[PDB]
Every structure is written in structure tokens, then in C-alpha cells.
Amino acid sequence: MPYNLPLPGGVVPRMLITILGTVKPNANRIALDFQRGNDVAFHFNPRFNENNRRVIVCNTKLDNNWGREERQSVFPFESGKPFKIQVLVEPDHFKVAVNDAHLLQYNHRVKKLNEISKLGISGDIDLTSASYTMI
Ligand SMILES: CC(=O)N[C@H]1[C@@H](Oc2ccc([N+](=O)[O-])cc2)O[C@H](CO)[C@H](O)[C@@H]1O[C@@H]1O[C@H](CO)[C@H](O)[C@H](O)[C@H]1O
Ligand SMILES: CC(=O)N[C@H]1[C@@H](Oc2ccc([N+](=O)[O-])cc2)O[C@H](CO)[C@H](O)[C@@H]1O[C@@H]1O[C@H](CO)[C@H](O)[C@H](O)[C@H]1O
């Protein structure tokens, strides 16, 4: 099962979200879901073993349909190891860093950031903490 991080004032530039945890043994997937109503503004989905390969899929869900995926092979997650995911919100994109190192960028497709009221956290991880602050 997952956990939901409420974002009362919605997503706003300068917001920094930090997810601390440990990847479960023989992990299959991890998923962060920034939601706007029934839409998923930003889906960050590390897939550990998809067709015998590790890949990170990012996408947006609108009107119950997923859009064009953005993929990358660099994969900084390992089963059973501690991890830290840091997401910085900029006016133009979500900046994702893993273990204090830039990982990727995802340009905003859903533009009304103020409406993105929560962040779903799911997958094969044990959560230590999931919080946010403004920097
Ligand atoms: C392993 C494989 O041949 N994957 C194909 C396949 O993927 C699926 C997945 C689910 C279902 N289904 O629930 O019915 C059918 C097929 O078909 C896809 C297109 O329909 C892709 O061709 C997929 O290959 C993967 O495509 C992605 C990009 O979409 C990427 O290129 C992957 O590297 C590639 O394996
Ligand atoms: C089951 C699976 O492999 N889902 C993939 C797949 O989806 C399909 C759906 C239908 C067919 N088909 O009828 O031949 C092929 C493949 O490929 C999609 C991309 O082309 C997605 O990768 C889909 O997985 C879904 O991806 C979205 C993000 O794009 C999100 O991660 C969903 O949770 C995930 O199921």
C-alpha cells in the first residue's frame, strides 16, 4: 500500500519535498504521484525489472489517459538500500535529485500548480519520512 502527503496550498515554486526510506529487497517498482483531482500532474516511476532492464518512466495522466512518456536509463535505486528522493518545484519544472545528486527534470504539463493538492507515494519502499518545506 501507499501513503498520501497532503499539500494544502498546492504545489508552489521553491517547494522542496524530501522522501527518506529504504528500498525493499527484490524491489519491482517505486512511484510518486503528484495529483490534481483525477489527473496525475507528475508520475515518477522507477521500474526495477521491465523486460530485463531498469528504467525510470515519467508521465502525466489527463482525462483518464496517460500522455507521451519521458524515459531514462540512469537508475540510482538498489533493492534493500537506503535512499533519498528530493523534488524541487520550479516555475517551469519538477527537479528530481536522488541521494543529493541531480537525477532528472520534468517540465510542467499541468500548469495550475496550486491545484496539485497531494503527493501519493507507493511501491517497494519502507518510508522513514516524507515531508516538505520552502527554500
Ligand atoms: C516487452 C515488450 O515487447 N513490450 C512492448 C509491448 O508492451 C506491452 C505491454 C502491455 C501490453 N498489454 O497490457 O496488452 C501489451 C504490450 O508493446 C508496447 C507497444 O504496445 C511496446 O512496444 C513495448 O515495448 C516497450 O516500448 C517502450 C516504449 O513504449 C520502450 O521502448 C521499451 O524499451 C520497450 O520494451
Ligand atoms: C501493463 C503495461 O506493460 N503497461 C504499460 C504499457 O501499456 C500498454 C497498454 C496497452 C498495450 N496494448 O494494448 O498493446 C500495450 C501497452 O505501455 C505504456 C506506454 O506505452 C505504459 O508504460 C504502461 O504502463 C503504465 O505507464 C503509466 C505511465 O505512462 C503508469 O506508470 C501506469 O501505472 C503504468 O501501468
Author numbering: 116 to 250
From the paper:
Galectins are a family of lectins, which is characterized by the affinity for recognizing β-galactoside-containing oligosaccharides through the evolutionarily conserved carbohydrate recognition domain (CRD). Gal-3 is a 31 kDa chimera-type galectin. The molecule used in this study is a truncated CRD domain of Gal-3, which will be called as Gal-3 CRD here after.
The crystal structures of Gal-3 CRD in the presence of TF antigen, lactose, TFN or GM1 were determined at 2.0 Å, 2.0 Å, 1.9 Å and 1.8 Å, respectively. Gal-3 also binds to two TF derivatives, TFN and GM1, with Kd of 65 µM and 57 µM, respectively. Electron density maps show that TF antigen, TFN and GM1 in the complexes are all well ordered and carbohydrate rings of TFs are in the chair conformations. In the structures of Gal-3 CRD complexed with TFN or GM1, the Arg186-water-Glu165-water motif-based hydrogen bond network involving in the recognition with GalNAc moiety of TF disaccharide is very conservative. The structures of Gal-3 CRD complexed with TF antigen and its derivatives show a unique binding mode based on the Glu-water-Arg-water motif for TF-recongnition as observed in the mushroom antitumor galectin AAL.
